[PDB]
Write a protein that binds this ligand. Sequence first.
Ligand SMILES: Cn1cc(-c2cc3c(N4CCN(c5ncc([C@@](C)(N)c6ccc(F)cc6)cn5)CC4)ncnn3c2)cn1
Length: 321
Amino acid sequence: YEIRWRVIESIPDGHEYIYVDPMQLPYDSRWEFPRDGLVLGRVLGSGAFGKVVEGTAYGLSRSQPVMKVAVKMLKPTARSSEKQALMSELKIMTHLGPHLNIVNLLGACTKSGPIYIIIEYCFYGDLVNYLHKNRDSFLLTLLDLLSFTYQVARGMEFLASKNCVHRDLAARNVLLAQGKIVKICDFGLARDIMHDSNYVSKGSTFLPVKWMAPESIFDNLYTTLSDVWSYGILLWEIFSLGGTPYPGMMVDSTFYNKIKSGYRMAKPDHATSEVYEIMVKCWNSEPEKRPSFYHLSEIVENLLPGQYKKSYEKIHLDFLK
Ligand SMILES: Cn1cc(-c2cc3c(N4CCN(c5ncc([C@@](C)(N)c6ccc(F)cc6)cn5)CC4)ncnn3c2)cn1
């Protein structure tokens, strides 16, 4: 190809070194959970082709013989396109490993019918409804907002270390667990970073434009660095207490023109000067200049009381006992 500026730089030293593709890896049978040990209850989120329901699981844990869970599944209206994606989503989760700030996978029903993905249940729901619920009380506290901001930073650091690009980081995809523990969810659009080069076929039809970095919209480039842009948008959501990004702006020619020119959202009412600067660094137009998720945690860690780090580590270690 003759136009070299349109070729993205591609990174393998010798034939001995291969990319471990999680899509190609075997399914550990220990994830399997009999379908007749799962009762399905109320819907937790739904869409045209799928839903997440609350479930009770009997005998999934030795600690909790009757345990509340969530269950990701497809509707009858879903086609084979949605069926292959849910499978690949299960593949990404079985190989990620567990983390304190991820809605962890507990099991799956893969053997007979449609796929069920069984995930831990988060008592408080998503961060957008939670922040709407508490708006009047705030005016929750400010430290809570910082704590949410740190935990997502650690969650994302864990994902990027596994070379996993989330591609839909947003407040609607942050849940709150029993001890005000923040959990990232929805790996439907998640891809390994080497996925787009090795098995090239994509075409998600509807995208979260207002959360996406310029090079993701315009060039279909998804990296950890475009996740960091989304993390900036997530921060704006949290400190506007559940606000809609770019409020009053339709996504159109002029919107894309504005973002490309350097337009950015103004500071939200409940963000400090220092916290707005984090969102600004996150929306740098040159992706390589955005801060890393490790660096972001270190910045946000400074904004929290000194003991928080020690207590957060105590929760974290305990979770993996
Ligand atoms: C009021 N309240 C609510 C909760 C709550 C809510 C969750 C939860 N979520 C629910 C939202 N999610 C979600 N919704 C839709 C999709 C789809 C439509 N795109 C989809 C579904 C299936 C499919 F195969 C493909 C696509 C995906 N995911 C998951 C996270 N998970 C755990 N606990 N929990 C607890 C608690 N109080």
